[PDB]
């Protein structure tokens, strides 16, 4: 019972930040929030678990908008530093 | 410009190690908009970054007891504070 | 050529309408203009072809708020239901 | 209650014939509905309706050629007009 009043305080405390926290951090507390009142997530969220399928999309749409000749010149110069870096 | 893509394409499949995901990730990120371009549909959810975020921060605490996730939440919670201030 | 116009002329029209089509037909009516002006979507989204994971989803989602009792209850004559019809 | 539900869940693994999807549908709902409750997590996308509707719509014409899309557009759009009229 110490640590639900230490809880129930802190997340309270949080609210009163005089600065807002980084992406990062207002993940970590989020997280932490939810486990500790709710628990484990209690569906597979379609796709979410598809962790192949998220990173294509992620990568792709991170390109949105280049020109198909800046693409293409981007994609070469990548290619030739992973070649250099590991070899053929 | 495309016989250099179409010689580097091929050449990236003689690498001697494999790259990193992030690396891979670039590459094929560029690979596509090259090729195809821009995605050309709207994924459900994809752009729903607040629901991702979420989804994302909170899988990944999954399986730690209410206790454990209790008591750093606390943790954390003191942590921002001491760093920002209150 | 011919085929354009009218593409042009009935996609026009279709904004003067006076009822809105139900759901199912603004579903075709897009469906068919994507595919028409755009071709094929062009990347897997995460999840859509998860097809079991969507379907659980679903289903499960139709049954927010009911209560343990009522859904306990419905399934009960549910399952009795399927008996009835399949045989044990 | 418990009792009758726990009986049921069993004896529905003993069916004949497997039912069809709404069917299976129905009884898995229920089924978590009953054992876990309300869905404890907003799944991306999965409250988007307007792109999912968008997503299944499109997908469902996978594979039509331009000209064929096209006419049947044309089709359903004037289908559409003689049905609710302009
Ligand atoms: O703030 P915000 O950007 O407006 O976020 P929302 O309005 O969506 O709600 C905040 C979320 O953080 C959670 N939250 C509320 N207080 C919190 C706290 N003190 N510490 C960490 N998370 C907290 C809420 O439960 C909510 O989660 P939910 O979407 O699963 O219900
Ligand atoms: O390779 P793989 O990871 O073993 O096979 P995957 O099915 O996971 O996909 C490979 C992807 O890389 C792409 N790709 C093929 N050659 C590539 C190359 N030389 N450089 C970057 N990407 C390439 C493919 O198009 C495919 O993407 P897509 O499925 O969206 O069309
Ligand atoms: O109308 P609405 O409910 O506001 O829908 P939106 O604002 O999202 O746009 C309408 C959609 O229908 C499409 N559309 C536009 N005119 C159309 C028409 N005449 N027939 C069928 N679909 C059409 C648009 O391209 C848009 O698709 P998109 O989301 O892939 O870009
Ligand atoms: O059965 P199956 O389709 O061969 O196995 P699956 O992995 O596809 O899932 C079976 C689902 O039915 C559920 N289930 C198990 N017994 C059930 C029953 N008697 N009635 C309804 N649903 C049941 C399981 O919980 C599982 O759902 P979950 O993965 O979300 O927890
Ligand atoms: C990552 C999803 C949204 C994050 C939700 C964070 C919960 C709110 C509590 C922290 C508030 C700190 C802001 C004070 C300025
Ligand atoms: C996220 C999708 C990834 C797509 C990857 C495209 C393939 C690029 C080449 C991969 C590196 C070649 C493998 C050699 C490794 C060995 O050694
Ligand atoms: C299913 C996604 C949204 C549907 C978009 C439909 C395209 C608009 C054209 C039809 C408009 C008919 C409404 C007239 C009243
Ligand atoms: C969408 C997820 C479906 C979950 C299904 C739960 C199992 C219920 C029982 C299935 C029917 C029993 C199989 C007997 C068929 C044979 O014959």
Do not use: H
């Amino acid at each position: 019972m110490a640590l639900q009043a230490d809880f129930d305080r802190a997340a309270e405390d949080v609210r009163k930040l005089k600065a807002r926290p980084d992406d990062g951090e207002l993940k970590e507390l989020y997280g932490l929030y939810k486990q500790a009142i709710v628990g484990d997530i209690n569906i597979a969220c379609p796709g979410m678990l598809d962790l192949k399928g998220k990173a294509k999309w992620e990568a792709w749409n991170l390109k949105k908008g280049l020109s198909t000749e800046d693409a293409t010149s981007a994609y070469i110069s990548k290619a030739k530093e992973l070649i250099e870096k590991y070899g053929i």
